[PDB]
Subunit: 446 residues, 3 copies
């Protein structure tokens, strides 16, 4: 009814003394100042937590979960040479000879300074082109044959002390050519596990990089490979190999323990964080990752721009000849990487498992095992120090760190800190706001 009658019976805390049934005194203004200030101190502090929730913040919980049976990560490796030298042929030097950086522009040799007599004359019968009847070419078939064969390289593999197999090593194709993948987990093979830490309860391979089978550099080229040794990218079984980008290396003559530490990272979907919220099954890979998007970003580009695919690409498109490489494929990489890089962006999913690495090198061989390794694989003693390496990937302990992001302020924490200060300053509620609306609805009709 009356304003002095309504304010004497409502649930607000200040109006019972402002609008009292008494004359105007000094107490009415000290209740007016202390209510109009405590309504303004509620106003700029409640709008803090509203705008703080509107940022959608999140802080991270780290934890070290202990386990017993961890999975082994897919040890993916290949030699830093593209392909062997004794497995190239005269027909191989015709369709793809200029691209392999041993030929000039007119399908002839560059300057033959610092070329051995036995090294040049094995190449010299390959570059006759006299009554040359060519054969049909395929760049995938060239990387199948001329690449480094697994049954020649790997002297002794191991896993958890048990023996290994070159049939367990699964071929892939990257920018370095014929690359293999231990513990791939595809083709129905279950991913192997580990039950202990230490240097013996992981992979232990003993490779042979075949330094005599490297491409002899005679002319200064753009992409000559001076180094010897392999390159390794450690990843989960879902992510395709990206050895060209995410790969470290080990040296020959250096047994290299690479201690991993399994991490299980969990991000948040928008609007909290940035992850691929759904699964997002890509067109040429059954699962999604940060790399499987990136090769699918490049595969659909080179099909729509050059009507073929490279040898390191998934799908079923036919492989580009070196006629398509020197004219279409290579000018279309830098046209996307440099110019149109903002047209394609991959959102990393928020269930990702990574593997750190802590390097440590030990020199192989000792002199006590020097003469033993020479005869046991029919090699010279000078051959052993610069061809034979050992890699060793394991886990420190059976535990994995998790890096998960907790939402720092949900809507249930906002309601606890709106009325946590709404009740502190004026004592109202959602019903008191509806109560003040229910009195003002009666005043406007009278």
């Amino acid at each position: 009814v009356s304003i002095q009658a309504f304010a004497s019976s409502s649930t607000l805390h200040g109006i019972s003394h402002i609008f009292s049934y008494e004359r105007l005194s000094l107490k009415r203004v000290v209740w007016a100042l202390c209510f109009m200030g405590s309504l303004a101190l509620l106003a700029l502090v409640c709008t803090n937590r509203i705008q703080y929730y509107f940022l959608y913040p999140h802080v991270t919980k780290l934890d070290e979960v202990a386990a017993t049976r961890l999975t082994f990560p897919a040890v993916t490796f290949c030699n830093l040479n593209e392909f062997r030298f004794s497995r190239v042929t005269k027909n191989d030097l015709y369709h793809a000879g200029e691209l392999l950086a041993l030929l000039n522009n007119r399908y002839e040799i560059p300057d033959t300074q610092t070329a051995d007599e036995k090294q040049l004359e094995i190449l010299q019968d390959k570059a006759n082109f006299r009554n040359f009847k060519p054969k049909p070419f395929n760049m995938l078939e060239f990387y199948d044959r001329a690449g480094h064969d697994i049954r020649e390289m790997l002297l002794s593999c191991f896993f958890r002390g048990e023996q290994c197999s070159p049939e367990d090593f699964k071929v892939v194709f990257t920018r370095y050519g014929k690359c293999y993948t231990f513990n791939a987990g595809q083709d129905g093979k279950p991913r192997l596990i580990t039950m202990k830490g230490g240097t013996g309860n992981g992979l232990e391979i003993m490779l042979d990089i075949q330094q005599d089978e490297y491409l002899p550099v005679w002319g200064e080229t753009d992409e000559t490979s001076f180094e010897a040794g392999i390159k390794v990218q450690i990843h989960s079984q879902d992510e395709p190999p990206l050895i060209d980008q995410l790969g470290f290396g080990v040296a020959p003559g250096f047994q290299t323990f690479v201690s991993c530490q399994e991490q299980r990272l969990i991000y948040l979907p928008p609007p909290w964080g940035d992850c691929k919220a759904t699964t997002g099954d890509s067109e040429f890979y059954d699962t999604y990752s940060i790399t499987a998007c990136r090769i699918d970003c490049e595969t659909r580009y080179l099909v729509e721009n050059c009507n073929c695919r490279m040898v390191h690409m998934p799908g079923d498109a036919p492989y580009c000849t070196p006629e398509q490489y020197k004219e279409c494929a290579d000018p279309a990489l830098d046209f996307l990487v440099e110019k149109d890089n903002e047209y394609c962006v991959c959102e990393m999913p928020c269930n990702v498992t990574r593997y750190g690495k802590e390097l440590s090198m030990v020199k192989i061989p000792s002199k006590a095992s020097a003469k033993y390794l020479a005869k046991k694989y029919n090699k010279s003693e000078q051959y052993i120090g610069e061809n034979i390496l050992v890699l060793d990937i394991f886990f420190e302990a059976l535990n994995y760190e998790t890096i998960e992001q907790k939402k720092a302020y949900e809507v249930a924490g906002l309601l606890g800190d709106i009325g946590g200060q709404m009740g502190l300053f004026i004592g109202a509620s959602i019903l008191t706001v509806l109560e003040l609306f229910d009195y003002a609805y009666e005043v406007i009709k009278h």
Copy 2:
């Protein structure tokens, strides 16, 4: 008294207009819907924060505390050979000859291919067993004598620029045998400190791995050691050495700065996190850690299963002969590691100090110091490149990172977000719930 009389004078916000002293109108149901909804919106949002507190969550605070006098971590190392070759004896080849992988099953030699004439005939008088009167054996005494002696290996140790001592190096026993521990901190010696970073204000040892004193491999065995170089585990002084598991290595001929970074990790006790809440003094180590539990997990097993202890074990039990090794001890490791691994689990304590490591190799020696290092220790020039290494462990700066876990939601934050939304939705309290009980207690008696 009456329901219209009680609701007109209570502290709830909605019942003053639902149960008014007026006829049934459209305002009674719009106060009934807006109260039965604001009682249900309180119901499913307060049960969010109750169940969120019942998970006992925690998020982590990272901080980089700066300091002046950091402690130096216990640099623990041993050569990757088990024991020397010139310090084995005919009696040593009888009681423990087959276990050291130089003998066949009938206490005879394996195939002697790739064996030098001077290397075989020093072994050939050890394996006579003709009128052989044996001596009493002890596997701890064999690892005391035949192991790599510290006064022969370490050419020059240093610490903070000041000189060092082989008497400061303290012997332990691991799976590799005679291992030493710089800055052990036990036997009343105070743990040394550092007052600066950089490569000169830490340890700088110059070892000599004695590659001529390695075990010559002639037959293909299960545990032949091809590599040369040492293995190092960095740890705090409390934790016992676990070089077999938590150890990295450095190579010979390679001065290897190993930059540490001191971390002081703090976890939470249950039910927040998982730590050993109390101290938990183990039976054979004065302090508790993740490793001291694990060796105590293995020591009590092999005493209860084989009535002895291994050479890398604490306590006072007598050491197992190789008769007990080939028949009891080795079959009881894999019976616990593979089968009964779930019977024993070590809870890592929540006051743990760790040390990261960032490797970096520099080749030693230069040609300017090549001929100097040859004569100054009476060594050949070919000996220097493959025997002499330098390790260098220090800190980057005088600061330690801390990784501590804050309890993200205590009971004082739950009470602020129960009544933070209880006062927002219905305006009640704990006393209003007691007030509604105090009116309903009067109704049931009338």
Copy 3:
């Protein structure tokens, strides 16, 4: 007016039934116990969150921001020799000969054991001092000339596949002498960027450490340098080089991919955390960092204590002669580092960008490129393996991790959890406390 009249009309929840207009019964004490307990349960729980806010806590948010154009960090390097041997002179051996550890106390040679005939006689005409007319000396001018020249060392630099320049390498001065800085960003040059990851889209230098130009060690000195190879500190362009402290190394004959990962760390100002809150422009560096404070901590010390500055110091003070080095400068370092270390402390600012590093070594050269690298730079084959190295610094992917510290409890979260439990326990507000003061103000006047 009356206490039974005031409590029947106030906004507290308990006083309406304690001070009722009825005789003393059992309900008055059960409302007295349940109010004096719910006033005490508010008391010790509200003082929890008050003292929890008074600690000013903070928890950290980790995030992995993806980007396209990252900046390249300033690759700062220098050879581990101080200066060349063929660029020292007779006058250079007079003013500074004893300090370079080739002379005795009486300006004569130490013991010449293990000294070559061609190596001693090139030094022997430098140490005549017979009718010696000296030249004016400057230690900055000695480190300009006698140091390792960039145009002799760097065989081939690269960046993003494009060519490089020795004019892009900018000289600085550290404890190792003549040090250079790729991508320095000073002198108006804009800091270069990267648009891709992988081993080819970063720096790729091919140095030549000039192992024939090292100082030949003949006598056992305090600071002889046995090792060969360079030292590298990766940092942002703002921070001055601190290669002596924050530097890792790479070896010769070892192509060493050093995979970075850009981090953008953000701390908090006091009283939350510890950072330099303002900019804090130092006296001799235009920007502030943790290192630029430390050299400014040492520059103002040695000017106020020795009236000069060292060669690795900023400013405009004249450089100290070796007369000032052996008598003033060296005794004033350890007088500050060991004794007065607590007089100077640098507060690290809270906008700091760091760069991690993940090492990986690959052996260079292969035998296929062995004879090519010998003639192409007019070097012997034995020279190539122990002088030629390659360093390679890049990024894994175009993304940077951020480690920022969120204030875990602001004043708006305190007010939500004071009245969140003030409204829960007694239902009061800030006005009810003023209401109880407004009744007690009337009682004391009557």
